[PDB]
Symmetry: D2
Subunit: 292 residues, 4 copies
């Protein structure tokens, strides 16, 4: 189907005081990512969208608004993973009908599922939706680790087309790239983009690309073209930004940067707290220093 | 109302092949807990009830059925914690509306929430429900650790009446016990009941009490009367059982123990797979050994 | 052949500013644990003795001074474990020569040894020494965890008479006590002595019994006599002490309590820093409160 | 003085059946690293030298034999870190007098030293030796983590010239490179050399360069030349070798690969077990496939 390599924004969502989606701001955020940050597509309802704090209706809300906001050319991946498999299937079917290019699903978490149970969860969504599937691996949030041998068993499925690799190890990533030459690998750690690039990833998905998407493009392009010294310098600059927002509370902070541009970025969904104003001056300095 | 001390069944839920609640079997399980296992109350929609695999209306269904199933002598605690705080509030209101004696909520997880975000999560649920709140602490599933200092901040609130302590450390438990002499402490590791008891807990909530609740009672009572060696022998026995069902897959195995009694214990909710019949002979050996 | 049941001080060692052993003060510390604290034996060259900071000759020093300072009635376990197996065996022979009742050896650490390698380490020391051996398990320091099955393989060997169980898990402790009902279990966490005792340990080894040995005996004895309410109260008091000394830097602080008694308790060995005098006032208040 | 950038073999040590150094084989292994594998220097008595299994006499023996077996032009770094700070300084004194260009010291481990205790461990060794110091950061074995803030504190010292970075995190590596441009960074993860190179390290130290030195050099040079696709394929090849030796027990297996060359590579030091002959055919296939 539609080519899915490239650079994606992990779509952020604006909320009102009652934890309701602000659909107008969400549209602005979608359009900022594509038209301003010049990104290839959106990764919708991932963790950085505050997805797992939402109800099924709101997730459908987000899928709709993001879909309608961007042109046909834009690549869309739908994170549909949930602790409720029936919900996952319901969302997978919904997005698929909305015209999303692939589904993605976080590894089942909370409970100590066996690999067998984690495997058949992917298989059960694929069988129900019949859309392509991208493994969403994020061990730092889930405590779930996937080995090469387990990837082998997963990638043996034709409709499991790739992995959103949001794990820090570059030994594993190298192993995965070599063991699976013809599968899609999108890296998920923004602060290691340049290393992921030269380790041969096919693209990247990231929340910071909502505000830093054009440096990310440069990093990606330059490293592939051999201009690695310049790519690393821009990685230096991007890590200045990443380290700073991480210290302030990443989702509210990124959205506050987005607010600066005239976007109705709203609030985080409770129990996340709003941006702490004690960081405001340090934040304004950042936006100024890096033109954000 | 009722005071909350005593021994609780962490209520197991029977499902069918489509992950929908088996009301009839559920009611049966609730009654096994009170009549056969002679327990004091039910902990409903906890981790052991496969609660985090459920959707909102299913969780309401489990609350309603459980309450219909037991008489008014029975204590009922409603676990309503959720990554969606709005859902937590809605469930809390509903459970309080049904007459549940108290609410409980797991510590917000998945995301790396700050403690103050965790704190105000409980404070918000309490403000909206005006029912008592029991902190559900289970670090082995959430990765969240609560310190003594942080407990002090939680327990300062008058409607945070106690904690479901599903944590393995007996130094921290002792420290909590001493520091909050008038708060409710219910231990959560069935396999360390005798130690928890002699550490002054006010009772316990456990999934294995669904099939081993008479032994748990004697462990608790005998321990409190200084008949320690007999209590500990019973712990020896209970841990044979707990170890075995852990090794087999605890939720489906406990329910298969119940199915042996004539109860319609149904199936686990996927991605949990049914009991592996390969464990059958070893399960049967256990049931006959300890007369379960 | 000496029954090795009982309560032991983990012998602290006093150093001068050049990290040389103070034999005068070390004798004072040894005799304090036996005469003043009325303990059953000494555990010599364990972790709390800053053993893994010493060279071979210093270890032999300590072994010598401790054995000479106590009566023939006094029990003596010699920790000889070392990453250098040649050194472990040499200290093994030395200590046995002096007439230590048993040897004890930490699980090999730093390198990711296989259990087989760890196992054959214990067996080799036994071969070379022909003395009894107590397994020293302290997973919090070594990062090494022994399974119930691995213990079976260690306790199979005939000179492995027991385990210094310096780990917090009372499920595993219970399983070990049931599987190996003839074996010696000495518990190692001072702050859970009462839980350990009712879990059927045969004794305890503790650094804080150098200054709180009298309460330790009462907890142990009262618990084994079924007076668990009084036993647990004393554990409250003791955990006040143990928490305080932990917060201050346990080795230098325990030796500063000892200095209070008129013992030449010297300094820690660098890179440990001396007692921080910002803590003096709070340490005086603790000593005064519990009459240490 | 000497320009310490470049590629080093982390020198392997051959032992006999009694854990004693094979001096002849040791000279051969040294000469292999420099003349056959064409490396720039030796990192002597590091973890891979099985250093922490040695006594003080043995570590000196290894320092001397390695120095005299190689040329004046060969860069020599002596790892003198130890839990015994007195031993560290005695070895640092010994290695400086023999002519070693720099010292290197593992972070103090086992005991939970504060950072200040760690910081001044380095300062003390430096003071007593006056030689240049390279921080040895290897969290996988020590369990010690050094923050950027903490690194800045260490790098204030003029004699602390850099770090052997043996941690997997490329965010922190990038942050350290950015913050300390004029400090030496040698990476310690052989399987991630190509990512380390584009992250601007000054060189690398590795155990596997004893058998794969030429590929290492090529990766390093190619990646810096911008030829990153060719450098990455060599990393693929290199990680086939690294993965295999790791799966068979890396120190025994690396020296068996040397023994294939006609080197008296001897045995590992117990508690390490020799190479398992079950792996021989797989090892022979690796040797033939990569011409080792």
């Amino acid at each position: 189907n539609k080519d899915l390599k490239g650079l994606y924004a992990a779509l952020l969502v604006p909320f009102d005081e009652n934890g309701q989606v602000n659909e107008q701001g969400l549209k602005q955020i979608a359009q900022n990512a594509i038209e301003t940050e010049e990104l290839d597509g959106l990764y919708v309802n991932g963790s950085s969208g505050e997805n797992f704090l939402l109800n099924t209706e709101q997730k459908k809300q987000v899928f709709k608004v993001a879909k309608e906001a961007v042109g046909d050319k834009v690549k869309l991946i739908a994170q549909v993973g949930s602790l409720d498999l029936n919900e996952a299937i319901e969302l997978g079917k919904y997005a698929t009908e909305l015209g999303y290019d692939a589904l993605s699903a976080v590894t089942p978490f909370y409970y100590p599922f066996t690999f067998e149970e984690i495997r058949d969860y992917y298989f059960d969504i694929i069988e129900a939706t019949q859309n392509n599937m991208i493994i969403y691996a994020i061990p730092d949030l889930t405590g779930v680790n996937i080995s090469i041998e387990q990837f082998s068993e997963l990638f043996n499925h034709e409709k499991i087309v790739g992995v959103k690799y949001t794990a820090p190890n570059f030994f594993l990533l190298e192993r995965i790239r070599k063991a699976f030459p013809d599968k899609l690998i999108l890296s998920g750690f923004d602060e290691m983009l340049v290393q992921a690039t030269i380790s041969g990833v096919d693209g990247a998905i990231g929340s910071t690309y909502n505000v830093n998407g054009r440096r990310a493009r440069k990093i990606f392009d330059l490293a592939r073209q051999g201009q690695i010294q310049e790519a690393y310098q821009l990685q230096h600059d991007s890590n200045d930004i990443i380290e700073t927002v991480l210290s302030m509370g990443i989702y509210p902070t990124l959205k506050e940067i987005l607010r600066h541009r005239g976007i109705d970025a709203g609030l985080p969904k409770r129990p996340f707290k709003p941006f702490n104003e004690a960081h405001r001056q340090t934040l304004d300095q950042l936006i100024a220093k890096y033109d954000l």
